[PDB]
Symmetry: none
C-alpha cells in the first residue's frame, strides 16, 4: 500500500511548488481530496455505483455515436472501416476522427444553454462544490462544466467572470480545464481505446482534483462578483453559432497540435545533434524523460521494471499530446513486450494519461482565454506551466486512487 | 389543373391574412409580380424553345462547375478520384471535399464578375424591368435583381447606401428576396449534391418577383422612397478566401444540425417507444404536419407524406439537410420511386434560404450595416421567413403545373 | 565557356538597362550602393553555386532544413494518419499526392518555428548582423537594411516589425525599397511548401539570400534616394506588448497564424486554377474560328515573354516554356507557376529540360512578386502607416517590376554559374 505514501509525496510536491503555504485553506483542499476518493469508491468499488456509471457511459456512448453520425455524413467514407482495411492503424485519422467532435460538443453546449439545462446542472453541482469546499462561485461553475463538456469549450461560459476573477480563481479554471477529460477528447479515446466508464470516472475525479491542486498553489486573494449585444434568437441560431465558434476553435487546436508535436521532433533532432558530437549518440528524449519521471513513476505504486517505461510515457504525456503517449502505450500492451501489465501498472498509467498536461493545451487555453480578456493576458500565460503541473497531478492523484482499487 | 389554381389561391390568401393593411396593397404591383413569375414559369418550363434555352444554360453552368471541380481535383488530389468509389462505394463521395470548394470557387468567380462589371449590367437591366412593370423603387428593384446571383456576405453591397434611409416596406422587401433566393455558390453546391440543375436555375430566377410579391402582399409601401479591390487577381483571391470561411461555417453548421437531429430522434425514439414507436422520428412528425400544405401545392398524398417531411426540414433546419435527404430518392438504386411532378415541386419549394437561422444572419449582418433599424428588423422577424417560404412555394406550384402539364424529366 | 558567359553578362546588362530606363530620375543614382548590391548578389551566387565551401554550407543548410521538414511531417503524420502514408501513393498513384495535406501544414509549422526563433532572439540577431553588413557596404538606411534582411526569413506572414517605428516617416525611396524587398522576398513559411511540391531546396535558399540585395538593387535603381534617412534618436517606437507572451504563446500564435494563412492560400489556389481552366476554355472556343482551338493562356504568355526568357539565358527551344512559367508568376502567383513546373522535373516527364534551364527557372520563380501581391502590401502597410497609403498604391506596379527584375537577375547569375559547373 504505497498509495497513501504516494499521495503524501504528491501533496508534498504541491507544497514545494506552492507559492504560499500559510494561506492554504485546509477546509477546502482536504475536503476536495476527500470528495475525489469518495466518488472514486462510489462509482467503482463498494456501492453498486457502477450501475449508474453504466447507464451514464451508455448515454454518452450514444452521444458520441450521434456526433459520429454527423461526421460520417460530412466526411463520408474517410471515417469508415475501409480506412483501417487499407492503411491499418494509420487509417485512423485524428483530424477527421476527433476534431469535428469539438464542433459537435460546442453546438450541443450552446443548445443546452438555450434550453437552460447546462444552467441547471452547473448551478446544482457547482452549488454543492462551493458549499462544501467554499471556493468561489465562478471557479465552481467552470469545474462543473468541465465534467460534461471539454476544456476547449469550457471557457465560453466563464466570460462574464474572467475580467473580474483574481489570480487564484483564474489559475483554478486553468488547471481544472487542463486536467479535465470530457467532450472532444472523451470521444477521441472512445474512438481508440473505448473504456467508457474509466474515462467517466476519470472526469468526475478530475474536476475536483483540479480544484484541489489549483488551491495548493495559488489558494486565495480578495473576492469576486458577477457582471453582465448579440444573443441567440432561436435554438437553430444557437446550434449554428456554437458550431462555428467550435469550428474555428478546432482549427486552432489542430494547428497547435501539429506545431508542438513537430517541435518536439525537432528537439529530438537537436539532442541527437549534440550527442553524436559528444560521441554518445542515438539518444531519445523519451528515455531522458523516462529517467526524469522514474522516481515519480515508482512512487505512485508502479513496480520499477515497469516504472521505467511508465515514466517515459508520462514524460511524453507532459511534453507531447497524450495521444502519442497512448500510441507507445498500446505499443507496450501489444504482445511480445518484455514489460508486463502487472494488472495494476496498466490501470494506473491509463488514468494518468487521460487528461491534457500537454503544452499545446496551455497554448490553447491561455490563447483563447487571453482573447476574452486581453488585459489579463500576461497574468494568464504566466501561470500556464504551473497549471500543467497542477492538472498533471490531478490526473495522477486519480491514478493513485486507481492503484488503491487495483488490489482485490 | 385546377388543383394548381387552388394552391395559388390558398397561398395568396394566406399572405393576405397576415398583411398589415389589406387595403393598402398595390394590385398592379403584386399581380404584376405573380403574372411575371408564372410567365417565366411557362416560358422556361413549357415552350420547347424555352426548355431548350434552359438546357443550354444548364450545360454552360455545368461546364463552369466542371472547371471548379478541376481546381478541386488539383487541391485535394486523388481523394476525389474514381478509386474512392471502388474502395468506399457510395461512401466514396465526401461531402466536404466534393461540395464546399464550389462555394469557394463561385465566391471568387462572383467577386471577379462584380468587379469587371458584368453583374452591374445585368442587375441594372433586370432591376429596370422590375421597377418598370412592378413600379417598385430602384433600390428594392436592384436588390431583388441582385439577390439572384450574389449572396451571403457580398450580397448587400448595392443596398448599403439606401438601408438607413430605406423605408419599412422596401426593407422587408430586401429581407424577403434575401431569403427567397439562393447564392450561386450554394447552388453549385446543390448541383454537386446531385440536385437537378435546371429546376434550380428556374427557381432562382423565379425568386425575385416572388420575393417582391409576398413582400408587397405582407408589407405594402405607405411612404415615399428616394432615388475595395485593386486588380482582378486580388479580387479573385478575396472572393476565394471569404468563400472559404463561409464554407467552413457551412460544414460545421451541417454537422451540428445533422448530429442534433439524430440525437433528438434518439430521444423521441425513447419517448414514443413507450407507446411502441421506435420508428418515431422528427422527420415523420414534420411530414405529418406539413402534409396538408404538401398536398395543397399539388403533391399526391402518397408522396406528400414525404414531401411534408422534406419541406419541414427545410423550414425548421435548413435547405442542405433537406436536399441531403432528398437526393437519396433520386438515385437509381432507390427503393421508393417518385412521380416526376413531385420531383419538380419539391426541388423548387426547397430552393431558397428561408429557414430559422437565416433570421439570425439577417439581423446580425444588417445590424452591422445599419444598427439603427435593428429593432425594426427583429420586429419584422419571421414575417420575412414566411414571405420567402411562400415565394418558393408558389414557384413550386407553378412548376408542378407545367411539368405536370407536359413532360419535364429527370 | 565563351558564348555562355557572354550571353549571361548580356542579360545582366539588359535587365539593368531596362531598370535605368524606368528610373524616376536617371540622374542621382548612387553607384556605390547599386553596384555594391549587384556585386554582392553575384558574389553570393559565386559562393553557394560554385565554390566548394559554399556548397558545403549550402548542402549542410539544405540537409538541416530537410530534417526540420521531416519533423513537421512527423506532425502531419500525427494529424492525418494514413492519408499521408505510402499507401496513398500505391493505391491512388500520382493522385495519391495530396497537396492540401502534404503542403499547407508545413506553412503552419514553419510559421510557428519562425515565430519561436524570432522570440528567442535569434532572428533579431541575424537580421541585425546581415543588415549591418548591407548598410555598411551599400550605405543605405538602417531601416531599409534591417527590412531586407528580415525578409530573407520571415516574409509577409509576420510583419517585419523592425521597421514599424520607421515606416510612417521614411522616404519614398525607403518605402519603395521595403515594398520591393517584400515582393522579391519569399517567406520561410511558403518555402517548405515549395519544397514538398518537388522544388529543389538549395536553389530556393540561394534565391532568397540573393533576393534581399537584389531587391535593394532594383529598388535603388528605380527609386534613388533624394532625401535624408532617419536617425534612431529621432524616433518613438511605441508598439509595446502585443502578440507574444512567451515561447509557448509564440509557437501557438505562429501556429494559428500560419493556419489561416494556409487556408487562405488553399482557397486562393482553388479559385485561380479553376479560373485558368475556365479562361482556357473560352480562349479555346473563340480560337476555334481562327484555326487554333488548342490556344491557351499558358500558350499566349509563353508566346509573349519568350524573348525575355531568351535574354536571361534560356535557349529558344525552351524559351516558350520558361516565358510561360514566369508569365504565370507575374500575372497570377508563384504557387501556380511551380505547380506546373514540377511536372517537368519528374523522370517520367515527356519533356527533358536542361540542368541550366531548370536552375534558371527555379530561381526566376522565387519571389512574391505578382499582380496579386500589391493589395497585401497596401493593406498590411496601411495598418502601420495609413497616411502613406496613397503613396503605396502609387508604387505598387513599380514595386512588382522591381522584385520581378531581382528574381530575374538572380536567375541569370544561376544560369551563368551552372554552365561554369
Ligand atoms: C440561353 C443562352 C445563354 C445561356 C443564350 O442563347 C440564346 O440562343 C437563342 C437560340 O435562338 C438565341 O435566339 C438567343 O439570342 C440566345 O441568347 C444560351 O447560349 C449560350 O451560348 C451559346 C449559344 O449562343 C451556347 O453554345 C452551345 O452550343 C455551341 C455549339 O458549338 C457550343 O459553344 C457549346 O456546345 C455550347 O456552349 C451555350 O451553351 C450557352 O451557354
Amino acid at each position: 500500500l504505497h498509495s497513501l505514501l504516494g499521495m503524501a509525496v504528491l501533496i508534498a510536491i504541491a507544497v514545494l511548488l506552492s507559492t504560499d503555504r500559510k494561506a492554504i485553506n485546509i477546509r477546502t483542499v482536504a475536503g476536495a481530496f476527500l470528495i475525489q476518493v469518495a466518488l472514486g469508491a462510489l462509482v467503482l468499488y463498494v456501492p453498486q455505483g457502477r450501475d449508474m456509471l453504466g447507464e451514464a457511459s451508455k448515454t454518452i456512448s450514444n452521444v458520441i455515436a450521434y456526433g459520429n453520425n454527423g461526421v460520417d455524413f460530412l466526411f463520408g467514407g474517410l471515417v469508415s472501416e475501409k480506412m483501417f482495411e487499407v492503411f491499418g492503424g494509420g487509417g485512423f485519422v485524428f483530424a477527421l476522427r476527433v476534431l469535428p467532435m469539438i464542433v459537435f460538443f460546442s453546438s450541443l453546449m450552446a443548445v443546452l444553454y438555450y434550453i437552460g439545462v447546462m444552467q441547471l446542472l452547473i448551478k446544482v453541482i457547482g452549488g454543492f462544490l462551493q458549499k462544501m469546499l467554499g471556493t468561489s462561485k465562478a471557479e465552481s461553475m467552470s469545474a462543473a462544466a468541465l465534467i460534461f463538456v471539454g476544456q476547449t469549450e469550457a471557457p465560453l461560459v466563464v466570460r462574464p467572470y474572467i475580467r473580474r476573477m483574481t489570480e487564484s480563481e483564474l489559475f483554478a479554471v486553468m488547471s481544472g480545464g487542463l486536467a479535465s477529460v470530457a467532450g472532444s477528447v472523451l470521444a477521441g479515446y472512445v474512438q481508440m481505446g473505448v473504456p467508457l466508464p474509466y474515462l467517466i470516472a476519470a472526469s468526475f475525479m478530475a474536476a475536483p482534483g483540479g480544484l484541489l491542486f489549483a488551491k495548493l498553489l495559488v489558494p486565495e486573494t480578495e473576492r469576486t462578483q458577477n457582471d453582465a449585444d448579440e444573443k441567440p434568437t432561436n435554438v437553430i441560431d444557437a446550434a449554428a453559432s456554437g458550431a462555428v465558434t467550435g469550428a474555428q476553435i478546432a482549427i486552432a487546436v489542430g494547428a497547435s497540435l501539429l506545431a508542438f508535436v513537430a517541435l518536439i521532433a525537432m528537439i529530438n533532432g537537436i539532442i541527437g545533434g549534440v550527442g553524436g558530437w559528444f560521441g554518445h549518440g542515438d539518444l531519445t528524449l523519451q528515455a531522458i524523460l523516462g529517467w526524469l519521471f522514474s522516481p515519480l513513476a515508482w512512487v505512485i505504486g508502479v513496480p520499477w521494471s515497469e516504472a521505467g517505461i511508465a515514466g517515459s510515457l508520462i514524460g511524453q504525456k507532459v511534453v507531447i499530446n497524450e495521444f502519442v503517449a497512448y500510441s507507445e502505450f498500446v505499443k507496450y500492451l501489444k504482445p511480445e513486450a518484455a514489460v508486463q501489465l502487472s494488472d495494476t501498472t496498466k490501470a494506473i498509467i491509463s488514468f494518468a494519461l487521460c487528461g491534457f498536461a500537454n503544452l499545446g493545451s496551455i497554448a490553447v487555453l491561455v490563447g483563447g482565454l487571453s482573447i476574452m480578456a486581453p488585459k489579463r493576458r500576461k497574468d494568464v500565460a504566466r501561470l500556464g506551466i504551473k497549471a500543467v503541473v497542477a492538472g498533471s497531478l490531478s490526473n495522477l492523484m486519480s491514478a493513485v486512487i486507481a492503484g488503491l482499487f487495483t488490489g482485490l
